[PDB]
UniProtKB/Swiss-Prot annotation:
It is found in: Nucleus. Induction: During mitosis. The mRNA encoding this protein contains an internal ribosome entry site (IRES) in its 5'-UTR. This 5'-UTR generally suppresses translation while specifically promoting expression during mitosis, when cap-dependent translation may be impaired. This is DNA cross-link repair 1A protein. Expressed in brain, heart, kidney, liver, pancreas, placenta and skeletal muscle. The chain holds residues 700 to 1040 of 1040 of the full protein. Belongs to the DNA repair metallo-beta-lactamase (DRMBL) family. May be required for DNA interstrand cross-link repair. Also required for checkpoint mediated cell cycle arrest in early prophase in response to mitotic spindle poisons. Possesses beta-lactamase activity, catalyzing the hydrolysis of penicillin G and nitrocefin. Exhibits no activity towards other beta-lactam antibiotic classes including cephalosporins (cefotaxime) and carbapenems (imipenem). Transmembrane segments: none annotated. Binds constitutively to TP53BP1. Binds CDC27, which is itself a component of the anaphase promoting complex (APC). Binds PIAS1. It comes from the Eukaryota.
Length: 341
């Protein structure tokens, strides 16, 4: 059944709750972003109102074929009324079109639902600064102190410098980047930019990227693989067997692959710096795992919460085990006692 952390009390609303059939008493289904664990269940047969960003609405229409009459896009940073209740959508710093949602309940309670987010100090100057938030539905994906990772900027600098060096040493090297969802587009776009190439990809992935309102996108991507020296492939294919295979397909245009796997966290983060990362190599193929995250580090999460000072926190990630739930509740209490709220 629909879990309680997907329901917004005092409303008929649910958030990211599309896989339970008809939720009894739901008058509006919000969708925070277009990732499969969140939209799971939506299709062309859905006949209830869906409230989302413009970009998520483009993806619902074009990729899932949800009918236009049930898609309700809202602008960001704008007070809107939905079934009698004031809401605001805020940028979540996750993947394209990802939002946080502020609900202003008729009784005076204010609720923030983060969806998936990567907390940033810039959020402390949004419409969130303007009133008190009583209840926080929090993306707790990396809520443990071992989870450190570098900034997105540091990671992109590493990838750009690595690729440019390799291709300038060997003009017959191919760059490949893995993907299995939207998000992390900066990785392959920044590398293609430094190399003066467009990124080549499948027709399905090109269609997905054409929904994202990225400026000048027609200048940056293509379905012509032969004219491109940065290829995107399914993340599943980013291994030695899959890459040797791909290289055979390029018809002796290339003699070397340099591949990037943008992982979330991996335990080499507890020891190794970004300057010190090394690839796995077999023959003329090298694979780099780079820690490009679109979720909060533990310290970024802690700073956000200690700034916001919520009265109650409801985790939305890692909720399935008693040990995880108890560990998270311990951190929340530490944070509250340290900051004095
Ligand atoms: Ni997500």
């Amino acid at each position: 059944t629909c879990p309680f952390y997907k329901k917004i009390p005092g409303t008929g609303f649910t958030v990211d709750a599309f896989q339970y059939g008809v939720v009894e008493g739901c008058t509006a289904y919000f969708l925070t972003h277009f990732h499969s664990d969140h939209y799971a269940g939506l299709s062309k047969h859905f006949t209830f109102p869906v409230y989302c960003s413009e970009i998520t609405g483009n993806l619902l229409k074009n990729k899932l074929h949800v009918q236009e009459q049930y898609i309700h896009p809202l602008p960001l940073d704008t007070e809107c009324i939905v079934n009698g209740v004031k809401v605001v959508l805020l940028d979540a710093n996750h993947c394209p079109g990802a939002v946080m949602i502020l609900f202003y309940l008729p009784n005076g309670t204010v609720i923030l639902h983060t969806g998936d987010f990567r907390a940033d100090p810039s959020m402390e100057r949004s419409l969130l600064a303007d009133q008190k938030v009583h209840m926080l539905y929090l993306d707790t994906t990396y809520c443990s102190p071992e989870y450190t990772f570098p900034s997105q900027q540091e990671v992109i600098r590493f990838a750009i410098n690595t690729a440019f060096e390799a291709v300038t040493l060997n003009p017959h090297a191919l760059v490949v980047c893995g993907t299995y969802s939207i998000g992390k587009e900066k990785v392959f776009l920044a590398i293609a930019d430094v190399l003066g190439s467009k990124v080549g990809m499948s027709q399905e992935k090109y269609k997905t990227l054409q929904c994202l309102n990225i400026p000048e996108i027609n200048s940056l991507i293509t379905t012509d693989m032969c004219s491109s020296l940065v290829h995107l492939l399914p993340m599943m294919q980013i291994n030695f067997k899959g890459l040797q295979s791909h290289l055979k397909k390029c018809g002796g245009k290339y003699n070397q692959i340099l591949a990037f796997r943008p992982t979330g966290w991996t335990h080499s983060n507890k020891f190794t710096r970004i300057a010190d990362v090394i690839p796995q190599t077999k023959g003329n193929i090298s694979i780099y795992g780079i820690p490009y995250s679109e979720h909060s580090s533990y310290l970024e999460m802690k700073r956000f919460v200690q700034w916001l000072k919520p009265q109650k926190i409801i985790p939305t990630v890692n909720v399935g085990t008693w040990k995880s739930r108890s560990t998270m509740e311990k951190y929340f209490r530490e944070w509250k006692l340290e900051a004095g709220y």
